[PDB]
């Protein structure tokens, strides 16, 4: 009835997709080979998981996902792993050479070789839908494929579909921790090119999740798997309203309607609570008010920034499980009372509420404790202007010397595109400065 | 004799309508399968007000379900009493509203309104004498606000002399459940004030206050708020279904309640409401019903009636009572608290007494107050609308669907004119 297509671009996208699809199969009881042990009805019915899983053959559920990568390493990890029989063999699309953390490669040189194949696969998936709401694109800014090919695919999908919601789950470049030396270039170019072709891009940060795993989960040494599982919990909290009925449902279009005040400001920060280990779970009364208050703690934000340095323009609180709406009402009123949580004057109604019935599902061998309820906050705040200014300063420092510029110019990039992207980023910084002014 | 067509639009509208039909089917002894298993002839004497008889000793609610997303309709169809509705009346699209008035009113609701109106006309042709329509919807969402206002306009054009009643869930003064509630609320009032006969203002904030302070409910879900709203809905049209000492149907209620064509926004109430613990300590008398009715903390609209003045008051009682006791209580209320009534209307309160109490009660009474204190709701909505519109916040989501700034300006002007009128008569 209502379908959603997930697109996983780059290594980060594919790994987060592995985590998300493990969590989906756990929540819906789908075996790793697509079979269902309680498969009483075959060939129809509801079975609300038709949003992400399509019924094929006789008693097999195939994810509505396209995995895209330019090198075969990660997709081959997928092709020979636990869920090799889950995905359609043609949904796992690979090139032959990586983008080498080069936006120019993944956008012009290499992305042009498989963009048509990816779009044809996406078209084949979309033709099997009757109520396709939108797409979910998982990627990272500071990467190669996940930046250049992500922007190219966003442009092509904006051309082909147009009015379908285009949501992104992006790994924002951390302010201190980093992987690539040329992350500012790729991040600025991606932001410039995919800005007007995206509806809502959810921001997460590896450094903030590191800090959350250290402080809250009591994990001194987490790997990328723990980060991927937490991001998967966030994704499941976002899509649970589609996959499960609740007291107050929120489809995907309501996110872009409620969280995006202006067409150029669509970067809401992800936040999840409660995130606690199993040891301290027995010593806390995880009430609605406690989790609602923990959602606004500066130490619990999934992006390394300080919300107290800015104002909230739009906030979305998605509750799950044993949640009473009166308690949500009271907790949000208490939040509005606090003077340390500043909202813009031009948004007197600042919250959007969603309440589901399905409690969070514990992944076997996971980190998070079994809780009765959880809240995922998607807040659009002006505090991300500081992160954008930091990225702009790094970009300026690297570009004033023309460092690494030849690596992009020799791949089909015209040098003026750097200047154009930088001017647009300055304009975006001015946008964020202007919306934060009370008048 | 008189028959009503029920239309429920939106997620909130569908939930409230499902609870309403559960309560109504319980009142008339209609089990979840449509079979009649009552114990009084009065249950079948006037059952055609809400039920079409499908030959085979089964009754079908004269209800039409409208939504732009099939999820709420699936939940309604699968739940209890979901098998009692006619399958042809589930008129839904596939796109979804997205809490956008522009979308749900000009694109998706416009694509679906033709089928919805076909179903409406089919239901209207099967009646002996159409009394009017009831619309159950919320003013904050996209399907509710836009779709319901579109349907109201269409039906008012097709049926200009029928009773158009709406039971609208209005935005709350403390916590909004949608970031763009001011826009949708203003654009919906701009149509409601022009096309409806009477609108009942229900606010979830006041319902939570009732459930906590009065009913002493630790964990009230929407299954209880919707039950309160359904109790109000059933008490409104009880004179059309069961006999009584003094009858007052929808037409006479609208006549007595609306002094001027634009001031038709009411504050519903209900009594008695007691917790299970305090139930053994309260004697149930007509003075107790009267005292609990005219109570600011008992209003289902989050507007204190003590900040305004009553234009007209409806008090529909149910159960075996004395006309003299009810009239004496009404007169005592009017005399002792005369400063809350407009001096240019004598005998503000119009009463009605039905002989059949609600299920499980000895007697009850539904309060319908038309107070000038409702201007607080519109002042707050207009302030929020202006604060958001001066900066074009979330405005592109509505201008990209076919609307322009002129329409928002006209809606704001109409809202402010309604505010000015309500203040003029205070």
């Amino acid at each position: 009835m209502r379908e959603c297509i997930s697109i996983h671009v780059g290594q980060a996208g594919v790994q987060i997709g592995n985590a998300c699809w493990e969590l989906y199969c756990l929540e819906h009881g789908i075996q790793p080979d697509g079979q269902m042990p309680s498969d009483k009805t075959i060939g129809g019915g509801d079975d609300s998981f038709n949003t992400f899983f399509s019924e094929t053959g006789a008693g097999k559920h195939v994810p509505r996902a396209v995995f895209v990568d330019l090198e075969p390493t990660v997709i081959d990890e997928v092709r020979t792993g636990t869920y090799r029989q889950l995905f359609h063999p043609e949904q796992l699309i690979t090139g032959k050479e990586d983008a080498a953390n080069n936006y120019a490669r993944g956008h012009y040189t290499i992305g042009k070789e498989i963009i048509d194949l990816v779009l044809d696969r996406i078209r084949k998936l979309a033709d099997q839908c009757t109520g396709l709401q939108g797409f979910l694109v998982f990627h990272s800014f500071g990467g190669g494929t996940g930046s250049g090919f992500t922007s190219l695919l966003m442009e092509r999908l904006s051309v082909d579909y147009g009015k379908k919601s285009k949501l992104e789950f992006s790994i924002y470049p951390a302010p201190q921790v980093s992987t690539a030396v040329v992350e500012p270039y790729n991040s600025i170019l991606t932001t410039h090119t995919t800005l007007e072709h995206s509806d809502c891009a959810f921001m997460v940060d590896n450094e903030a999740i590191y800090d959350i795993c250290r402080r809250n989960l009591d994990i001194e040494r987490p790997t990328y798997t723990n980060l991927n599982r937490l991001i998967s919990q966030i994704v499941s909290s976002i899509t649970a309203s589609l996959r499960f009925d609740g007291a107050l449902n929120v489809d995907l279009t309501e996110f872009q309607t409620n969280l995006v005040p202006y067409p150029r400001i669509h970067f809401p920060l992800a936040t999840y609570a409660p995130v606690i280990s199993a040891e301290k779970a027995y010593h806390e009364q995880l009430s609605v008010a406690e989790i609602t208050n923990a959602c606004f703690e500066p130490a619990n934000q999934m992006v390394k920034c300080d919300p107290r340095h800015g104002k909230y323009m739009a906030c979305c609180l998605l509750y799950r499980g044993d949640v009473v709406p009166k308690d949500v009402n009271a907790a949000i009123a208490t939040i509005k009372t606090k003077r340390s949580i500043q909202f813009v004057d031009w948004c007197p109604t600042g919250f959007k509420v969603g309440i589901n019935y399905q409690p969070p599902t514990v992944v076997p061998g996971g980190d998070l404790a079994k809780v009765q309820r959880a809240v995922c906050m998607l807040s659009n705040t002006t505090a991300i202007a500081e992160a954008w200014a930091r990225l702009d300063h790094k970009f300026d420092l690297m570009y004033a010397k023309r460092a690494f510029v030849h690596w992009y110019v020799g791949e089909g990039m015209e040098e003026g595109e750097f200047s154009e992207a930088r001017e647009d980023m300055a304009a975006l910084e001015k946008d964020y400065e202007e919306v934060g002014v009370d008048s | 004799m008189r028959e009503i067509v029920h239309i429920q639009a939106g997620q909130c509208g569908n939930q409230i309508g499902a609870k309403f039909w559960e309560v109504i089917s319980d009142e008339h002894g209609i089990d979840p399968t449509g079979s009649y298993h009552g114990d009084s002839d009065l249950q079948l004497e006037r059952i055609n007000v809400y039920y079409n008889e499908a030959a085979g000793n089964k009754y079908v609610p004269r209800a039409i379900l409208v939504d732009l997303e099939p999820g709420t309709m699936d939940s309604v169809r699968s739940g209890p009493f979901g098998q009692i509705f006619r399958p042809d009346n589930f008129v839904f699209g596939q796109s979804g509203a997205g809490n956008n008035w522009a979308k749900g009113h000009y694109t998706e609701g416009a694509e679906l309104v033709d089928s919805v109106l076909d179903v409406v006309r089919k239901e209207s042709e099967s009646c002996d004498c159409l009394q009017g329509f009831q619309l159950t919807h919320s003013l904050g969402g996209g399907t509710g606000s836009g779709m319901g206002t579109l349907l109201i306009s269409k039906i008012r054009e097709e049926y200009p002399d029928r009773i158009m009643n709406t039971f609208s869930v209005v935005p709350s003064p403390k916590v909004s459940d949608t970031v763009v509630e001011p826009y949708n609320a203003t654009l919906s009032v701009h149509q409601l004030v022009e096309n409806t006969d009477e609108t009942y203002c229900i606010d979830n904030e006041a319902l939570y206050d009732i459930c906590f302070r009065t009913l002493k409910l630790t964990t009230p879900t929407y299954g209880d708020l919707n039950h309160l709203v359904s109790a109000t809905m059933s008490g409104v049209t009880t004179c059309l279904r069961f006999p009584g000492q003094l009858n007052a149907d929808l037409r006479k209620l609208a006549v007595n309640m609306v002094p001027f064509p634009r001031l038709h926004f009411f504050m519903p109430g209900f009594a008695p409401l007691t917790s299970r613990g305090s139930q053994q300590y309260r004697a149930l008398t007509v003075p107790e019903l009267t005292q609990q009715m005219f109570d600011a903390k008992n209003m289902m609209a989050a507007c204190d009636p003590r900040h305004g003045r009553y234009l007209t008051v409806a008090a529909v009682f149910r159960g075996r009572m004395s006309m003299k006791e009810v009239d004496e209580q009404m007169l005592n209320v009017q005399n002792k608290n005369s400063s809350y009534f407009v001096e240019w209307i004598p005998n503000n309160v119009k009463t009605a007494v039905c002989d059949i109490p609600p299920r499980g009660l000895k007697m009850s009474a539904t309060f319908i107050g038309n107070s000038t204190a409702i201007q607080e709701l519109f002042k707050r909505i207009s302030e929020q609308f202006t604060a958001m519109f001066r900066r074009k916040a979330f405005l592109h989501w509505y201008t990209g669907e076919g609307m322009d700034e002129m329409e928002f300006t006209e809606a704001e002007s109409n809202m402010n004119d309604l505010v000015s009128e309500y203040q003029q008569y205070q």
Binding site: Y262, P263, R264, I265, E423, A426, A427, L428, K430, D431, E433, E434, V435, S439 | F389, R390, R391, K392, E405
Partner: peptide, 12 residues
């Protein structure tokens, strides 16, 4: 550099 969103176009 100038901003691009029209947040002040109808500040009336």
């Amino acid at each position: 550099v100038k901003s691009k969103i029209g947040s002040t176009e109808n500040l009336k």
